[PDB]
Amino acid sequence: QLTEEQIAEFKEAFSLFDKDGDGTITTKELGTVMRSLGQNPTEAELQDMINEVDADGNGTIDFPEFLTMMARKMKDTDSEEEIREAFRVFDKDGNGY
Amino acid sequence: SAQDFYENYEPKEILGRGVSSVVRRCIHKPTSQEYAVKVIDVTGGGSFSPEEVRELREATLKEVDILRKVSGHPNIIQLKDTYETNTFFFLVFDLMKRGELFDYLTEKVTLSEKETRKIMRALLEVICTLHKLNIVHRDLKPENILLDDNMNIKLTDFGFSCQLEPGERLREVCGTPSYLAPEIIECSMNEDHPGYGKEVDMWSTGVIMYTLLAGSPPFWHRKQMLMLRMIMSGNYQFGSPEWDDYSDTVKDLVSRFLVVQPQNRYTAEEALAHPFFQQYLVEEVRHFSPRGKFKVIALTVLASVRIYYQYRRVKPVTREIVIRDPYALRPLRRLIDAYAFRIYGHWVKKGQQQNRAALFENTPKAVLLSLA
Amino acid sequence: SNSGVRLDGYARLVQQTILCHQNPVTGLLPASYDQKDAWVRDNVYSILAVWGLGLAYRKNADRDEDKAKAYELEQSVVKLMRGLLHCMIRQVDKVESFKYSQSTKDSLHAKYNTKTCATVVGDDQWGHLQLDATSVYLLFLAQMTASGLHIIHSLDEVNFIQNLVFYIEAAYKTADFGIWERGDKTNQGISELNASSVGMAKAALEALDELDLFGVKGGPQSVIHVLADEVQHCQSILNSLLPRASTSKEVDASLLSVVSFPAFAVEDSQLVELTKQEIITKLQGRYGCCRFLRDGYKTPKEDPNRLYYEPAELKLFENIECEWPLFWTYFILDGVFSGNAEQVQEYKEALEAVLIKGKNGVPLLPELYSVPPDRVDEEYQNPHTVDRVPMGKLPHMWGQSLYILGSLMAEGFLAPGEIDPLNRRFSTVPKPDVVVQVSILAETEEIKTILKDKGIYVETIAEVYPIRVQPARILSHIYSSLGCNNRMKLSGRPYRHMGVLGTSKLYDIRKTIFTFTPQFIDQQQFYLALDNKMIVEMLRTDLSYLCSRWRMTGQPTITFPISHSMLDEDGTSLNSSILAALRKMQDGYFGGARVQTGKLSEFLTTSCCTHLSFMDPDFKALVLQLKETSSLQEQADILYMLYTMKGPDWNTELYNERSATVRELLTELYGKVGEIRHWGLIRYISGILRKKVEALDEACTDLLSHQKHLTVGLPPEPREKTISAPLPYEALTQLIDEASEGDMSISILTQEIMVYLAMYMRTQPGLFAEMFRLRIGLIIQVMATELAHSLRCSAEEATEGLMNLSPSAMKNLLHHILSGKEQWQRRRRLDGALNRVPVGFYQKVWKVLQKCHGLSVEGFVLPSSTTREMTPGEIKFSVHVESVLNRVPQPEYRQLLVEAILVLTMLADIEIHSIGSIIAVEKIVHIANDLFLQEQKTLGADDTMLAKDPASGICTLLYDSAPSGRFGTMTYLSKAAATYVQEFLPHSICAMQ
Ligand SMILES: Nc1ncnc2c1ncn2[C@@H]1O[C@H](COP(=O)(O)OP(=O)(O)OP(=O)(O)O)[C@@H](O)[C@H]1O
């Protein structure tokens, strides 16, 4: 079961994902966010990701789609891999914390 | 009289057929409308005694009374004008350019999440509106559900439905054999269980949801008694390769809609309250302590990292699994299922003997099939 | 006046262009160039400008010069019409024999010579079958007669015109060479049905429905009578055959001549706009429209001095077809006629540029434009880009005359109602409704008393002395004596059945009103009328048909007599079905029509009344055994064996006082059997009498109008030749008898199934979709197999039950079988037996053949070189694929091959590459079966589960397996196809997307 705090956090994440409020994360905004973070995904890779995340070929991702994607279960190994990757990305400096 | 109906309604090409009725389009000359007229015979070619004739007349009068009772609902079908003659009954409805839900279901195999969500919402609205007026249908089937140009479903076939009072329970059994609650079999065993209730529509809605989503009825077998015992026992299971790529919210909603115990079955109002059907536009009361902001930031970071891994987790063509097992690839499985449905697309009509689940054989045709 | 100057200029143009070649004495102009030959259609279309000019000049009366000019123009038109009429009269013998056994060698020659009115070519050096020319000539003759011009001068001419109308009335079930005189795209000495032909024939029949050829001064003896059944049949044919050009042509530019000013023979204006849109999309060019796709006329190749071009037009004439401004003139006329003004201006502006000047600056319309031989590749690579050059007959009389008429109409000097006095412009106006009248009579006093007791008021056969009731056979016999002449050796109308639309209208003979019962209630002709359910269903269908079109003026009337054969077992009350039908008719509603019950005298006040002016003044031991034998079935067998041995027409000498032939005894036996209502020897009696279902040719042409193939009897290789074109009644009966052979009753069963299929085609034209060929013998075998399965009896018992089945039960069973409703093995056998395939199966097969070298079906081979010669929308490719797939005689194996082809198509769609080899679908299904057997052995199935087919080598569980699922047949087929592809790949996979 979900919670009100989780719903509010998901809504805030959806709002912050796109620079302009239109109900869609948008490929251009996602690419700009990726470049700001320090990543340069290929156009073909981004198109493949958009197609896979979306349930059809409409080419637009919505807030319910993001909520469903965030609801996936990673089990155990994927969870530790994800947290390790997040820590490595956050630990850019050579300090160990 | 019949003269007024003839002068106001013009018979046209046949649009549908029934057990004893024919549905054709009609045009209202003063308005030049495109309504539809339903004609049902009384004597049926003189094939039965007048007792059947008066029983049919009683059924039609009950249906017209119920339809007038719920008249005015845009989502419910509307009976504009009704006519009765000695040997012919004329009823006027709203003609719809799209076919029944069965045809669309067999054409599209499986509908999208938005389509099934809106269909479920409309049907739930139908059931709560009917229950507020103390009316039960007991015939919630895809065949009785149609669609229009706006992709809006409307319930039809109100003849089986009858108005009921608190404290009385029905005993007659009717409908497709795979749409019976355990109350029906309990009451019809010899005499023990009291009668019908209100959760028959609940399990009917659950069966509609399962059939539309999974593509096949939840319960189906080549034998009457076998599937009757299966549905009575409530031993339904979710398919492994079909329900794997689906959300949990619809799964638990369906499971609650398929509860064997009538008391534990979710009501319509609880179904509307489910997180599946709620929507939000804008709110300004989302204020909390900095702990809440930190939790929101952490959840946003986790979601971003999760979405950062989607493209790298995609599988390549991998012809090896394709040759070893063609069901591994979801698009390929969908394509082959659609091709199989199109090959035998002329054999999906009314009747429990042949249905969507007949075309699917998940069980292995081995020696274990002999055991029963 | 300025209008006078414009009219003088138009007259000068006409005189200098068309009237210069008047060719006096005869009056038939040459067809331009150095041809010295006259075409009926060309001359008729050329004289339209002269007729319009004369009509325009006639308005400006009260002057000697204008009156003289108008009189001269009308005299020239009349002279041309009389010359054409004499030319047709010169072939009276051909016109008379065409009427019986319609053939290409019996029609009048389309090419008529110049003065002295003789024949110019032989009966086999040209295609002398063009009903369009005769139809347009008759239509325009009727139009000018209604205008006021006098053409017909004698009663012999009236009789000849009636004979010509009779000859052209059979245009809806015959194949002709068409307008282009070349049949289909490939000549090959073949002809096929054309929509333009039947449309113009229907329009001509409509125009001459009740026209008086002698004008206002004519009498009742000079009127032409035309049946309405033929017109409605042609209308239905056109409606069911006009989404394209014909069976072989996807689109033709001549379709404008059906949906525009000429003959206005079309309804459902939406269909007209749709067809015009496709014509514009697929034919419009920079210098007019092309005649049709893939035409080699006037091309820089294909050896112009050659005919009957071999089938090698894969790419030679594609995208370089010539274009004709005549279709632009057609568009101009269509726009200027109905309601269009801007379209007329734009088309005139477009046409003015393609016009080429002549002597003294006279406008001239070139016949067609041709692509230069040097710039051929550029046009193919860049369509509609190169510049063409004028060619053909520069003084094109047809095009120039049509352009002159269109310009005259646009200038306002002429009105649409002048050229069309018959008011054919409003043919697209929707019909509001129609009320049909039904009268019920009692044959005897007992029937009337019974009906009165049941609340039904009717009138007996008597007490109606001013009115007479006779069957439709008398009406047919009477109509057979119309247009009969002895001096000219005219045999009149050939005997034919009369439909519901003919017997409904009242007839006045010898100052007496005559009414006729519908032809379908005759029990003597056939046993179909015996069954009450058939009676009521067919009455409802006929009522629906009558209410649908009713193109004839006046209210209709249907007479329904009550016979003694429809009573119950006790013979004291009417049957339930008839009583219910009568009660429904009383309530003013039955089937899909509104009915009102009343008296014949009341209906006589307003009704459709027609006046017929032409009607104005040891053997002895065998015989003893037959007489004394019981077991009526054995009696029929005995009668049959003496009929086959020594009883064709010889008297059996059974009686002594009177000598009764075998036919009389057969009729007596049939009458006796009809009372007991036992269907054991009725089929044998009908087969012995050789009774044939009425309107069998109508059913055949209705079935064939939807691009379907008919095959009668069980299929061996040599016999049961397929049917692709309509055939006369005699030829159809001969073919049916030959297919039936000595079984006799097989012919009756085939006729019953054929008529049921034709009847169900009209009511539900969605059930027969996805099926390309219909096999009556295969259907019979399938029905017998299902009867044997249901009754768990032998084949002989199943056949006996099928014979004993009532006609209503037969129709219900056929409906259920065709519906495919009531395990997987039987379903697959049913699907394969009726050769049911997806709609897009042809396109998938064509794409696979394009992407693969060929397909192997364990025997012969289907090359991929046929994809360039053929097209997916052409029927020849479809029948070729069906014949290739029909080699295997196992319906289940046929379905397996079909699904293997489907999965191979899916794989080819997924995998982008070229196979570059021959793939064996038999090897694929064998590999799939082997994989299924291995999987079953691994799972734990024993020897009894892993069954072996006696003559196909396929596991029974594979047949019983469902198509879709985790262990479905499609998964195994996909695995086998991918395994074969890998086996025929260079040690790797080439599938990505
Ligand atoms: N407005 C409409 N547009 C199209 N079809 C309609 C309309 N109203 C009714 N129909 C058709 O009429 C029928 C309505 O059901 P009806 O009760 O007449 O049939 P039945 O054989 O008794 O069973 P069922 O109700 O379960 O379909 C269906 O076939 C439906 O498609």
Q: Which of C876, C864, C872 is nearest to C844 (CA)?
A: C872
Residue B243 falls inside a structural domain? yes
The amino acid sitting at C146 is A
Burial of B242 (0-12, 13-18, 19+ CB in 10 A): buried
Q: Are residues B265 and B123 in the same domain?
A: yes
Q: Which residues contact B324 (CB under 8 A, 6 or more apart)?
A: none
Of B112, B248, B308, the CB nearest to A71: B248
Residue A95 falls inside a structural domain? no
CB pairs B-C closer than 8 Å: 133
Q: Can you spell out the DSSP letters for B117-150?
A: HHHHHHHHHHHHHHHHTTEE-S---GGGEEE-TT
CA B357, CA B217: separation in Å to the nearest integer? 6
CA A81, CA C419: separation in Å to the nearest integer? 89
A10: contact with B, CB 8 A cutoff: yes
Q: Are residues B32 and B138 in the same domain?
A: no
CA B200, CA B257: separation in Å to the nearest integer? 10
Residue B258 falls inside a structural domain? yes
Q: Which two tokens stand for residue B111?
A: 């509908």
The amino acid sitting at C65 is E
Contact B254, B213 (CB under 8 A): yes
Are chains A and C in contact at 3+ CB pairs closer than 8 Å?
Answer: no
CB atoms within 10 A of CB C940: 11
Q: Are residues B69 and B112 in the same domain?
A: no
CA B144, CA B18: separation in Å to the nearest integer? 12
Residue B368 falls inside a structural domain? no
The amino acid sitting at C201 is A
Side-chain half-sphere exposure of C465, counting CA atoms within 13 A? 1
Beta C356-357 vs B153-155: how paired, if at all?
A: unpaired
Number of H helices, E strands in chain B: 13, 9
Residue with tokens 């209906």: C603
Contact C42, C30 (CB under 8 A): no
b/e sequence C450-472, b meaning 16+ C-beta within 10 Å: bbeeeebebbbeeebeebebebb
Q: Which of B52, B49, B213, B77 is nearest to B146 (CA)?
A: B77
Give the residue numbers spanning the domain of B150: 101-272
CA A43, CA A47: separation in Å to the nearest integer? 6
For residue B135, what are the β-bridge partners?
B163
Q: What are phi and psi of B280, to 5 degrees?
A: -130, 140
Contact B332, B318 (CB under 8 A): no
Burial of B87 (0-12, 13-18, 19+ CB in 10 A): middle
CA C296, CA C187: separation in Å to the nearest integer? 11
End-to-end CA distance of chain B: 60
Q: Are residues B265 and B171 in the same domain?
A: yes
Q: Which two tokens stand for residue C165?
A: 């109308």
Residue where one domain finishes, among candidates B220, B238, B272 = B272
CA C768, CA C779: separation in Å to the nearest integer? 13
Ligand 1-lining residues (CB < 6 angstroms) = B 15-16, 18-19, 21, 23, 36, 93, 95-96, 100, 143-144, 156-157
CA C746, CA C49: separation in Å to the nearest integer? 59
Residue A48 falls inside a structural domain? yes
Q: Which of B17, B20, B23, B179 has most ligand 1 atoms within 8 Å of CB, for mutation? A: B23
For residue B28, what are the β-bridge partners?
B9
CA C326, CA C332: separation in Å to the nearest integer? 10
3-state DSSP: chain B helix, strand, coil percent, rounded to 5?
A: 40, 10, 45
Residue B110 falls inside a structural domain? yes
**C442, containing H or E segment:** strand C436-442
Residue with tokens 């820590």: A87
b/e sequence C712-737, b meaning 16+ C-beta within 10 Å: bbbeeeeebeebeebbbbeebbebbb
Of B10, B85, B347, the CB nearest to C433: B10
Q: Can you spell out the DSSP letters for C73-97?
A: HHHHHHHHHHHHHHHHHTTHHHHHH
Residue B130 falls inside a structural domain? yes
Burial of C252 (0-12, 13-18, 19+ CB in 10 A): buried
Give the sign of the dihedral formed by CA C84, CA C89, CA C91, CA C94: positive
Query: Any idea how long chain C is?
Result: 993
Look up the CATH number of the domain holding residue A84: 1.10.238.10
| C-alpha B92 – ligand 1 centre gap (Å) | 13
Q: Which of C25, C20, C94, C86 is nearest to C50 (CA)?
A: C20
CA C597, CA C582: separation in Å to the nearest integer? 10
CA C722, CA C667: separation in Å to the nearest integer? 35
What are the E-state strand segments in C762-921? 773-775, 854-856, 862-863, 918-920
What distance separates the 2 farthest-apart alpha carbons in chain B? 82
Calculate the dihedral angle through the C-alpha atoms of C307, C310, C314, C318, rounding to the nearest 10 degrees: 0
CA B58, CA B275: separation in Å to the nearest integer? 43
Q: Are residues B169 and B201 in the same domain?
A: yes
Side-chain half-sphere exposure of B260, counting CA atoms within 13 A? 11
Contact C604, C513 (CB under 8 A): yes
CA C840, CA C906: separation in Å to the nearest integer? 13
CA B102, CA B110: separation in Å to the nearest integer? 11
Look up the CATH number of the domain holding residue B143: 1.10.510.10
Q: Are residues B199 and B81 in the same domain?
A: no
Contact C200, C473 (CB under 8 A): no
Of B280, B286, B314, the CB nearest to A52: B314
Q: How far is CA C686 from the centre of its chain?
A: 28
Q: Which two tokens stand for residue A72?
A: 């996936």
What are the E-state strand segments in C594-637? 595-597, 609-611
Burial of C981 (0-12, 13-18, 19+ CB in 10 A): buried
Cβ distance A13 to B296 less than 8 Å, yes or no, reads: yes
Residue where one domain finishes, among candidates B250, B272, B294 = B272
**Experimental resolution (Å):** 3.5
Query: Among the residues of C863-920, which ranges form H helices?
Result: 866-869, 875-885, 891-910
Residue B115 falls inside a structural domain? yes
Residue A35 falls inside a structural domain? yes
Q: Which residues contact B179 (CB under 8 A, 6 or more apart)?
A: B139, B140, B141, B203, B204, B207
Cβ distance B361 to C967 less than 8 Å, yes or no, reads: yes
Q: Are residues B89 and B105 in the same domain?
A: no
Q: Are residues B146 and B202 in the same domain?
A: yes
Q: Are residues B86 and B114 in the same domain?
A: no
Residue A9 falls inside a structural domain? yes
| Number of domains within chain B | 2
The amino acid sitting at C540 is R
Cβ distance C979 to B323 less than 8 Å, yes or no, reads: yes
CB atoms within 10 A of CB C21: 14
Look up the CATH number of the domain holding residue B35: 3.30.200.20
Complete edge-to-edge strand list for the sheet that includes strand C854-856: C862-863, C854-856, C918-920
Burial of C686 (0-12, 13-18, 19+ CB in 10 A): buried
Give the residue numbers spanning the domain of A83: 4-90
Q: Which of B88, B60, B159 is nearest to C592 (CA)?
A: B88
Residue where one domain finishes, among candidates B58, B93, B128 = B93
Q: Are residues B24 and B41 in the same domain?
A: yes
Cβ distance C941 to B222 less than 8 Å, yes or no, reads: no
Q: Are residues B84 and B160 in the same domain?
A: no
What are the E-state strand segments in B124-282? 135-136, 145-147, 153-155, 162-163
Contact C918, C985 (CB under 8 A): no
CB atoms within 10 A of CB B17: 10
CA C681, CA B359: separation in Å to the nearest integer? 44
The catalytic residue positions of B are: 139
Calculate the dihedral angle through the C-alpha atoms of B100, B104, B106, B109, rounding to the nearest 10 degrees: -150
3-state DSSP: chain C helix, strand, coil percent, rounded to 5?
A: 50, 10, 40
Distances (CA, A) of B99 to B144, B210, B344, C224: 11, 21, 19, 50
From chain A, the residues in CB contact with B113 under 8 A are 55
CA B293, CA B299: separation in Å to the nearest integer? 10
Q: Are residues B121 and B248 in the same domain?
A: yes
Indicate the SS3 state at residue C711. strand
For ligand 1, atom 31, which residue shows the shortest CA distance?
B16
What distance separates the 2 farthest-apart alpha carbons in chain C? 110
CA C162, CA C964: separation in Å to the nearest integer? 64
